[PDB]
């Protein structure tokens, strides 16, 4: 219910409260064990990082991958694509923005 | 201790203002407050201190030789 | 103020907390604007009436030097046109126009309280004062540098709407002072009383339990009458033990 | 009964001392301390108990004295502040000595639990010996 | 209250205040139960007050635990949870 | 009018006010006691306050002896304590009169539960201002703790606590058992169990006591006794070493 | 010794009712949430164990008691008031019954004696009435399975499926949600687990939930063989491992 | 809602019975009584209010006795203290009936304690507003207990109650440090007389009469005896010189 609601908070901007809808599911599907697969749990984590990039907070994105409590050992190609977007926001260059576009195009696009 | 002070509401603020006015001027000892009553029942930590009632002087009934001096 | 912060000793546990939530935000409010927080507005100090209440009232304004606004509960409830309304509003405006102002309330149980059934029979003045205090704080005009100190007999008998955060953020009990804190008090009021150099200040601390500057003056009253009987201009260190022991029987 | 407690200290101090100053002293603390220690009743701690440390000094290697000092603050004791006064004094004998005591001053900091862990509300001595350790590491 | 419904206040009020990456807001959610809007908002407010007491312009993890013990227990009364007598 | 707080009747809020005021009388003495269980035994420790120097430390006891096996721990005034003490010793004797074997642990808690109800159910009897705590070693389930409140309710407890500070003592006992995932403490000798309860007691309180300020009950298998002043002092010296 | 209050504490209110009984229903509606359902082949009884501390073992307290093992019971209300009813009901069902009829009482006969005992302390002076509500359901050789709802006033009422407790307002709709005459004994268990879960604010497992059903006569729970007339007790209390096994089938 | 003091079973919001607190006030309005606990025996001392010279000395004695081996003394109302001893004396014969042995101190301690705690439960009966002080010698030693109107009693190395208990408790604590081992029965009589004169400052409005009795092992051999002869005369002249 929060994942379907968090999508409605995308085109409406206001990403401050949109991260709570996505973070509520991460700990919810984590305790489901077999009920969640590897690919389904990977897409849920991508929603949290995508909401923070729209909110423009660099420190909160680095705390997700660095801290094991926030990461819970979930990593893939599409997850690393969100890190390249956050690094391109500080330097403000479209070269690194389109760099991860072609390589990660499978999962990213 | 009760909540029935609604009828005593005028009496309640009487003792409250007494504590307030005695704290206004602490440099004047020439204003004396004396209360002559039958006995003491309800106490208070606010009533016992400087500038207020402190020494309790009992007024018992006169003794054998005391009534002889009064009548004389 | 006429009473500094050295005569309120024994409350130093609370004194360290009160100075940081009152003296610190009043002298330098600009430190909170950088973080984005808000300082508390009111400070609720309850306890037994008459003990340390008069001292802490003048002690807050002494370490500051601002104006001391005293609000007696007797004059708050009267029969007039707009009585308690004009008292709080003009005080609210006088605190905004003049920043160095400290408001102190004494015995708010008369103007407060839950009563019994929460009905009103000649009770309209109780709700008149309480509703105005809560409405001025949550409005679009707050008090940044203004501190309001309230006192009552019991905290549980007041309005729970005020105790919630957003208006009154400070609830602090006033218990009896410790033994090490009553030594500094006994060196102040007794200093004005003429005595000798052999006077022992450690005689009372053993027999004193929760005796502030108000209770020690009763010991000086009994010691002042003793100097006339013995034809002396001072008192012996034994007069301190006999005077505190008499007070310890009536008090705690 | 009044001064008789402090008179029994110097009596074994005179006659014969060989290697036995450790057992003939610290064991006396177990007999006393039971009903004593009110205000002025101290005949040993803070006064004579500090003299025992002065007796154990200049006797054997400081490693044995450093271990016996922990046992005083281990079981019961009285006040850690009184022990902190002795620790400040031991640092003075080690400073005027030096020689092989350069590494001894480091072992005293780690062995005593007063410096490593919280004991009494006065920690002033805990940071005093710590600054001396910084001067050793900087060299 | 709910875990996310309370988190909506943490992610909002604390967004306007300076904090540190060491401080974690997840510990103040699950541990807290049945709190109003101002009580949770007072946690971020008291954390900033205690930081000024130590002269700090940010919010650390230690300042959260010091301000947590004050607002965690609103019930001092006894004789509760009584299904008997 | 004020008969709700005078005699025991159904209140508009569904609470008995007269009985609830008896619980506040348990904290008048300010005694915080915890009960822990070993492997085959159970050890309980209670606080002891001696305000007057003329008090005899041998006569003052907060932990009584019901029989050679089952003990009792009471927090509160002695007059309400002896009311439940005379019945507990009598009902334990009446059991072997009609049966002949030893009363189990959960049985004495039930016998005293209906008796404490008589005070609450009947208006002419006031409820006791004490709380009953029974610890012993059962012949089947082994160590067990049954703490009977004046309400007349009893249920099994892993490690319980009482007094105003019981909230701080309980928090210490929660973090210790969740790590070991066991209800009791596993130890062979019963002397080490005494040191285990003192460790959790000091950290919850934050102060130290002497041999005369504490009373340590010890319930072993088929035996029960109470440590004297010299035995409690030996436990404080033994725990001083190592930890 | 010489009780001086013989007057009843329950008096008629000026509104036309009894205050002591009306105020006793408050503790019933504020008590522990329980439920029961009567099927054709058996009766299911479920309740929730609410512990004020995590260190309190819930295995000692039994919220589902046993009078005679044709009938289960549960209390939505004061425990001590319920415990004295257990000792007295077993007495009138054995000393005053089994010593006469030489058998065990049915469901309708058991609620008749318990209802009279609850009123004894209500009318008598110097004693407080019973504010506990009981649910008594069992099997009969003729009328079959029958369930009753015992009020603290002493008036029982028959019910097919009833739930009383804190969430009793919303629980009655859940028992009236899916119901028919084709329900089984195990089919009512899955409904009981989903209904009770609505009122559980804490952990939900076999330890914190007490589930007891009334089935056929169990020879394994009897203890002897060779007598065909007695096949064993009908009442069976489920363990912690059996409750968790039926949770994955929901 | 007031009225908490109108019944014994009604508890105050703080959990303290008002009737119990009022029973202590009745003790402060009565004649004080002291006591001394020795090793081989116990010593009891109590004064008397002298209205005029019409009172005949050594006739009416507030010190009671339980069998021959136990003395008793109370401070408070006269009928309350004497009735409690009668219950203990009648039950003392029941103990010798079944058990054939004389009742010791620990068996006599719980004897009077069960009655006082029973009156607090029943609101229809009045509790004893007196402070009972009893003692004696048994097979295990000599013990001294002090009973309170609330039914609270424990071991006491000294017993002080009544109006003058404030100055009496200070002297009993000094005798412990002066004699940590024990005290003789003859010296305890002289020391108990000085304590009585110390509390006489409030009683100076009238005269005074001292009644001292003690029971020990090596002297009375478990027999309750009153101080008479030259032992009483030497004890009076010794305390009167030290008090002034």
Structure tokens at G11: 């008096």
Q: Is C118 left (phi over 0), alpha (psi -120 to 50) or beta?
A: left
Looking at beta carbons, which residues of chain F come within 8 Å of E82? Answer: 15, 20, 151
C78 vs D108: CA distance, rounded Å: 74
- Choose among A2, A16, A69: nearest Cβ to E11: A16
Residues with Cβ < 8 Å from D95, sequence gap 6 or more? Answer: none
Q: Is C196 annotated as a binding residue?
A: no
Q: Please enumerate in sequence order all residues whose Cβ is within 8 A of that of B47, keeping only pairs 6 or more positions apart, or say none.
A: B53, C50
Determine H/A contact with 3+ CB pairs under 8 A as the test: no
- Residues of chain F whose C-beta is under 8 A from some C-beta in G? 7-16, 106, 110, 113-114, 116-117, 120-124, 146, 151-160, 170, 173-174, 177, 183
Eight-class DSSP state of D125: H
| Spatial CB neighbours of B39, under 8 Å, sequence gap ≥ 6 | none
Is the Cα torsion angle C113, C117, C120, C121 positive or negative in sign? Answer: negative
Residue E83 forms contact with G (CB below 8 Å): yes
The distance in angstroms from the start CA to the end CA of chain H is 54
**Three-state DSSP class for G65?**
strand
Would strands G56-57 and H207-216 be described as parallel, antiparallel, or unpaired?
unpaired
For G12-44, give the DSSP string: B-TTSSBHHHHHHHHHHHTS--EEEEE-SS-EE
Q: Strands of G56-57's sheet, edge to edge?
A: F63-65, F71-75, F131-138, F142-148, F156-157, G56-57
Strands (E), C132-175: 147-150, 168-173
B17 with C74: Cβ contact below 8 A: yes
**Residue C16, φ and ψ in degrees, nearest 5:** -65, -30
**Cα separation, A108 vs A89, whole angstroms:** 18
Whole-angstrom Cα distance, residue G214 to residue G70?
7
C-beta neighbour count of C206 within 10 angstroms:
11
Q: How far is CA C221 from CA A37, C183, C239, G51, in A?
A: 85, 19, 11, 59
Residues 6 or more apart whose CB falls under 8 angstroms from that of H5 comprise H18, H19, H22
Three-state DSSP at C168 gives: strand
Residues of H forming the active site: 31
Question: Residue C222: is it exposed, middle or buried by C-beta count within 10 angstroms (0-12/13-18/19+)?
Answer: middle
Measured from the Cβ of residue F121, the count of other Cβ atoms closer than 10 Å reads 25
Residue D66, both tokens: 């450093």
Distance CA F98, CA C115 (A): 58
Edge-to-edge strand list for the sheet holding H41-50:
H158-161, H33-37, H41-50, H207-216, H225-226
Does C54 show up as a binding residue in the annotation? yes
Strand H70-75 to H63-66 pairing: antiparallel
Residue of E1, E2, E21 best to disrupt the A interface, most CBs of A under 10 A: E21
Q: Gap positions in chain A, given as the residue before each gap (C–N > 2.5 A)? A: none
For residue H230, give both structure tokens: 């030259």
Q: How far apart are CA G79 and CA E83, in angstroms?
A: 8
Q: Tell if the CB–CB gap between E48 and C24 is shorter than 8 Å.
A: no
H189-222 exposure pattern, b = at least 16 Cβ within 10 A, e = fewer:
bbbbbbbbbbbbeebeeeeeebbbbbbbbeebeb
| CA distance readout (Å), H145 to F27, F229, H160, H175, H194 | 25, 20, 11, 18, 22
CATH 3.60.21.10 assigned to domain H2-244? The reply is no
Question: What's the CATH number for F2-242?
Answer: 3.60.20.10
C107: closest CA among C167, C46, C52?
A: C46
The DSSP bridge pattern shows strands C67-72 and C101-106 to be: parallel
Q: How long, in residues, is chain G? A: 250
Q: Are G59 and G47 in contact (CB under 8 A)?
A: no
Q: Could you give phi then psi for residue G74, rounded to 5 degrees?
A: -155, 155
In this structure, what token pair is assigned to residue G155?
């008036």
C51 annotated among ligand-binding-site residues: yes
Cα A37–A39–A44 angle (5° rounding)? 95
Question: What SS3 string covers chain H?
Answer: CCCHHHCCCCCCCCCCCHHHHHHHHHHHCCCCEEEEECCCEEEEEEEEEECCCCCCCCCCCCEEEECCCEEEEEECCHHHHHHHHHHHHHHHHHHHHHCCCCCCHHHHHHHHHHHHHHHHHCCCCCCCCCEEEEEEEECCEEEEEECCCCCCCCEECEEEECCCHHHHHHHHHHHHHHCCCCCCHHHHHHHHHHHHHHHHHCCCCCEEEEEEEEEECCCCCCCCEECCCHHHHHHHHHHHHHHC
Q: Number of C-alpha atoms within 13 angstroms, CB side, residue C65?
A: 1
Preceding-residue numbers of gaps in chain B (C–N over 2.5 Å): none
Point out which residues pair with G38 in neighbouring strands. Answer: G43
Nearest Cα residue to G29 out of G167, G202, G197, G158: G167
For chains E and F, what is the number of CB pairs under 8 angstroms?
Answer: 18
CA angle F116, F117, F123 (to 5 degrees): 105
Query: Nearest-CA neighbor of F103 among F225, F233, F243, F224?
Result: F224
CATH number, domain with residue G20:
3.60.20.10
Of A21, A24, A63, the CB nearest to E21: A63
Q: Does C47 show up as a binding residue in the annotation? A: yes
Task: Tell whether the torsion through CA atoms of G91, G92, G94 and G99 is positive or negative.
Answer: positive
Rounded CA separation C35/C24 (Å): 15
CA G97 – CA G66 distance, rounded (Å):
17
Beta-carbon contacts of C229 under 8 Å, excluding residues fewer than 6 positions away, are: none
Whole-angstrom distance, CA of residue H24 vs CA of residue F90: 32
Q: How far is CA F226 from CA C50, D87, F30, F72, G204, in A?
A: 49, 42, 21, 11, 42
Question: Which positions ≥6 away from H83 have C-beta within 8 Å?
Answer: H128
Q: How far is D128 from D120, CA to CA, in rounded Å? A: 15
Question: E21 to chain A: which residues are within 8 Å by CB?
Answer: 59, 62-63
Return the number of other C-beta atoms located less than 10 Å from residue H151's C-beta: 25
CA distances (Å), G79 to each of A98, D71, F147, F152, G82, in order? 71, 55, 16, 9, 5
Nearest partner of H199 among H26, H25, H21, H28, judged by Cα: H28
Q: Where are the domains of chain H?
A: 2-244
Residue G29, judged by CB atoms within 10 A of its CB (0-12, 13-18, 19+), counts as middle
Residue E85 to residue G52, Cβ atoms within 8 A: no
Q: Is C155 annotated as a binding residue?
A: no
Distances (CA, A) of G150 to C204, G62, G136: 67, 19, 7
Three-state secondary-structure class, residue A41: helix
For the CA atoms of H55, H59, H65, H71, the dihedral, rounded to the nearest 10 degrees, stands at 70
Query: For residue H21, how many other CB atoms are within 10 A of its CB?
Result: 13
Parallel, antiparallel or unpaired: strands C147-150 and C42-46: parallel
Q: Report how many domains make up chain G.
A: 1
Please give the residue of chain F at the shortest CA–CA distance from D73: F240
Nearest neighbour of F120 by CB, restricted to E78, E79, E85: E85
Picking from H48, H67, H66, the residue whose alpha carbon sits closest to that of residue H57 is H48
Q: How many B/C residue pairs have CB atoms within 8 Å?
A: 67
| Three-state DSSP class for residue A70 | helix
Query: What is G103-148 written as a DSSP string?
Result: S---HHHHHHHHHHHHHHHHHSBTB------EEEEE--SSS-SEEE
The whole-angstrom separation of Cα D19 and Cα D59 is 8
């Amino acid at each position: 219910l929060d994942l379907m609601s968090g999508i409605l908070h995308c085109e409406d901007k206001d990403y401050k409260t949109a991260f709570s809808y996505f973070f509520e599911s991460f700990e919810s599907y984590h305790n489901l064990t077999t009920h969640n697969s590897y690919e389904k749990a990977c897409q849920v984590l991508k929603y949290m990082l995508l909401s923070k990039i729209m909110l423009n907070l660099i420190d909160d994105v680095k705390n997700i991958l660095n801290a094991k409590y926030t990461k819970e050992t979930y990593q893939s190609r599409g997850i690393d694509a969100m890190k390249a977007v956050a690094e391109a926001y500080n330097n403000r260059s479209l070269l690194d923005f389109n760099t991860a576009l072609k390589q990660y195009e499978k999962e990213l696009m | 201790f009760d909540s029935e002070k609604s009828g005593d509401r005028e009496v309640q603020r009487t003792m409250l203002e007494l504590l307030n006015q005695l704290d206004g001027f602490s440099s004047d000892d020439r204003v004396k407050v004396l209360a002559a009553t039958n006995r003491v029942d309800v106490l208070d930590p606010a009533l016992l201190r400087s500038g207020r009632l402190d020494r309790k002087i009992e007024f018992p009934l006169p003794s054998e030789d005391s009534r002889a001096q009064i009548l004389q | 103020g006429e009473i500094t912060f050295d005569g309120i000793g024994g409350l130093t546990e609370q004194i360290r907390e009160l100075r940081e939530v009152i003296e610190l935000p009043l002298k330098n409010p600009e430190i909170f604007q950088r973080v984005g927080i808000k300082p508390p507005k009111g400070v609720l100090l309850y306890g037994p009436p008459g003990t340390g209440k008069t001292l802490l009232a003048k002690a807050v304004a002494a370490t500051i030097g601002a104006n001391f606004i005293f609000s007696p509960a007797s004059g708050i409830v009267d029969k007039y046109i707009g009585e308690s309304a004009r008292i709080i509003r003009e005080m609210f405006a006088y605190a905004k126009e003049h920043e160095p102002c400290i408001i102190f309330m004494d015995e708010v149980d008369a103007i407060g309280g839950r009563r019994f059934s929460e009905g009103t029979s000649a009770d309209r003045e109780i709700q008149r004062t309480l509703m105005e205090l809560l409405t001025q704080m949550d409005g679009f005009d707050n008090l940044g540098q203004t501190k309001i100190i309230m006192a009552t007999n019991r905290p549980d008998t007041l309005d729970p709407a005020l105790l919630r955060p957003g208006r009154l953020d400070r609830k602090v009990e006033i218990p009896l002072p410790n033994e090490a804190g009553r030594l500094e008090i006994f060196k102040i009021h007794t200093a004005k009383v003429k005595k000798t150099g052999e006077f022992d200040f450690e005689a009372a601390v053993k027999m004193s339990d929760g005796f502030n500057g108000a209770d020690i003056r009763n010991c000086a009253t009994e010691a002042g009458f003793f100097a006339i009987r013995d034809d002396r201009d001072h008192i012996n260190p034994d007069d301190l033990m006999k005077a505190v022991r008499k007070v310890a029987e009536v008090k705690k | 009964k009044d001064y008789s407690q402090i008179l029994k200290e110097e009596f074994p101090k005179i006659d014969s001392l060989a290697q036995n100053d450790c057992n003939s002293a610290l064991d006396q603390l177990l007999v006393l301390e039971k009903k004593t220690r009110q205000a002025s009743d101290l005949a040993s701690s803070k006064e004579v108990l500090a003299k025992i440390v002065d007796l154990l000094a200049s006797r054997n290697k400081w490693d044995d004295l450093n271990e016996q000092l922990t046992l005083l603050s281990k079981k019961h004791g009285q006040l850690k502040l009184s022990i902190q006064y002795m620790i400040q004094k031991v640092m003075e004998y080690l400073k005027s000595s030096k020689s092989l005591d350069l590494n001894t001053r480091i072992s005293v900091i780690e062995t005593i639990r007063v410096v490593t862990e919280n004991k009494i509300f006065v920690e002033v001595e805990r940071a005093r010996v710590t600054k001396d350790l910084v001067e050793i590491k900087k060299e | 209250r709910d875990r996310r419904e309370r988190r909506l206040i943490f992610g909002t009020i604390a967004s306007k205040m300076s904090l540190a990456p060491e401080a974690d807001l997840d510990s103040l959610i699950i541990r807290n139960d049945s709190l109003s809007g101002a009580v949770i908002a007072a946690i971020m407010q008291e954390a900033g007050l205690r930081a000024v007491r130590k002269n700090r312009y940010v919010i650390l993890q230690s300042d959260l635990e010091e301000a947590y013990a004050t607002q965690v227990k609103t019930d001092n009364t006894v004789d509760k949870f009584d299904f008997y007598k | 009018a004020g008969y709700d707080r005078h005699i025991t009747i159904f209140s508009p809020e569904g609470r008995l006010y007269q009985v609830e005021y008896a619980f506040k009388a348990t904290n008048q003495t300010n005694i915080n006691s915890l009960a822990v269980r070993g492997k085959d035994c159970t050890v309980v420790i209670s606080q002891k306050k001696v305000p007057d120097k003329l008090l005899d430390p041998t006569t003052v006891s907060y932990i009584f002896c019901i029989s050679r096996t089952i003990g009792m721990v009471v927090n509160g005034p002695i007059p309400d304590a002896r009311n439940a003490a005379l019945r507990a010793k009598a009902e334990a004797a009446e059991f072997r009169y009609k049966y002949g074997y030893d009363m189990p642990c959960d049985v004495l808690a039930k016998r005293m539960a209906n008796l404490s109800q008589i005070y609450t159910q009947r208006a002419y009897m006031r409820p006791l201002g004490v709380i009953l705590t029974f610890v012993s070693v059962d012949e089947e389930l082994g160590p067990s703790i049954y703490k009977t409140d004046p309400a007349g309710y009893y249920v099994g407890y892993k490690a319980t606590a009482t007094g105003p500070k019981q909230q701080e003592i309980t928090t210490n006992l929660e973090n210790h058992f969740k790590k070991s995932k066991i209800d009791h403490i596993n130890e062979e000798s019963w002397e080490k169990v005494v040191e285990f309860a003192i460790t959790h007691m000091i950290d919850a309180l934050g102060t130290e006591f002497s041999k005369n300020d504490l009373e340590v009950g010890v319930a072993t298998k088929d035996k029960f006794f109470t440590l004297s002043a010299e035995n409690i002092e030996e436990r404080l010296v033994a725990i001083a070493e190592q930890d | 010794m010489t009780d001086r209050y013989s007057f009843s504490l329950t008096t008629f209110s000026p509104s036309g009712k009894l205050g002591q009984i009306d105020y006793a229903l408050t503790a019933v509606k504020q008590g522990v949430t329980s439920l029961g359902i009567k099927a054709t082949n058996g009766v299911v009884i479920a309740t929730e164990k609410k512990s004020s501390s995590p260190l309190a073992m819930s295995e000692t307290l039994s919220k589902v008691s046993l009078l005679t093992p044709d009938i289960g019971a549960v209390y939505s209300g004061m425990g001590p008031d319920y415990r004295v009813l257990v000792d007295k009901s077993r007495k009138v069902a054995h000393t005053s019954y089994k010593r006469i009829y030489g058998e065990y009482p049915p469901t309708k006969l058991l609620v008749s004696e318990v209802a009279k005992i609850m009123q004894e302390a209500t009318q008598s002076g110097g004693v407080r009435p019973f504010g506990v509500s009981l649910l008594i359901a069992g099997h009969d050789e003729f009328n079959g399975f029958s369930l009753y709802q015992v009020d603290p006033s002493g008036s029982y009422f028959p019910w097919k499926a009833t739930a009383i407790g804190k969430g009793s307002v919303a629980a009655k709709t859940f028992l009236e949600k899916r119901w028919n005459d084709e329900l089984e004994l195990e089919d009512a268990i899955h409904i009981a687990l989903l209904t009770l879960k609505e009122s559980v604010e804490g952990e939900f497992n076999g330890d914190t939930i007490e589930l007891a059903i009334i089935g056929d006569e169990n020879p394994d729970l009897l203890g002897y063989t060779g007598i065909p007339t007695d096949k064993g007790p009908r009442f069976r209390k489920l363990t912690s491992q059996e409750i968790n096994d039926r949770l994955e089938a929901l | 809602g007031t009225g908490y003091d109108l019944s014994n079973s009604v508890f105050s919001p703080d959990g303290r019975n008002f009737q119990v607190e009022y029973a202590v006030k009745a003790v402060e309005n009565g004649t004080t009584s002291i006591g001394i606990k020795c090793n081989d025996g116990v010593v009891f001392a109590v004064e008397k209010l002298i209205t005029s010279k019409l009172l005949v000395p050594q006739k009416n004695v507030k010190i009671q006795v339980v069998d021959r081996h136990i003395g008793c003394v109370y401070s408070g109302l006269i009928p309350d203290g004497r009735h409690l001893v009668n219950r203990g004396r009648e039950e003392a014969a029941s103990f010798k009936k079944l058990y054939k042995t004389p009742i010791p101190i620990p068996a006599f301690a719980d004897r009077l304690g069960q009655y006082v705690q029973a009156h607090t439960l029943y609101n229809s009966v009045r509790p004893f507003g007196v402070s009972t002080i009893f003692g004696g010698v048994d097979k295990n030693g000599a013990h001294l207990y002090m009973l309170e109107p609330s039914g609270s009693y424990w071991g006491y190395k000294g017993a002080a109650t009544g109006k003058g208990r404030q100055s009496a408790k200070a002297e009993l604590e000094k005798l412990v440090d002066h004699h940590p081992e024990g005290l003789s029965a003859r010296e305890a009589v002289k020391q108990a007389a000085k304590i009585i004169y110390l509390a006489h400052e409030d009683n100076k409005e009238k005269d005074f009469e001292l009644e001292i009795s003690w029971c020990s092992l090596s002297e009375t051999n478990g027999l309750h005896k009153f101080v008479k002869g030259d032992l009483l005369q030497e004890a009076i002249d010794f305390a009167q010189k030290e008090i002034n």
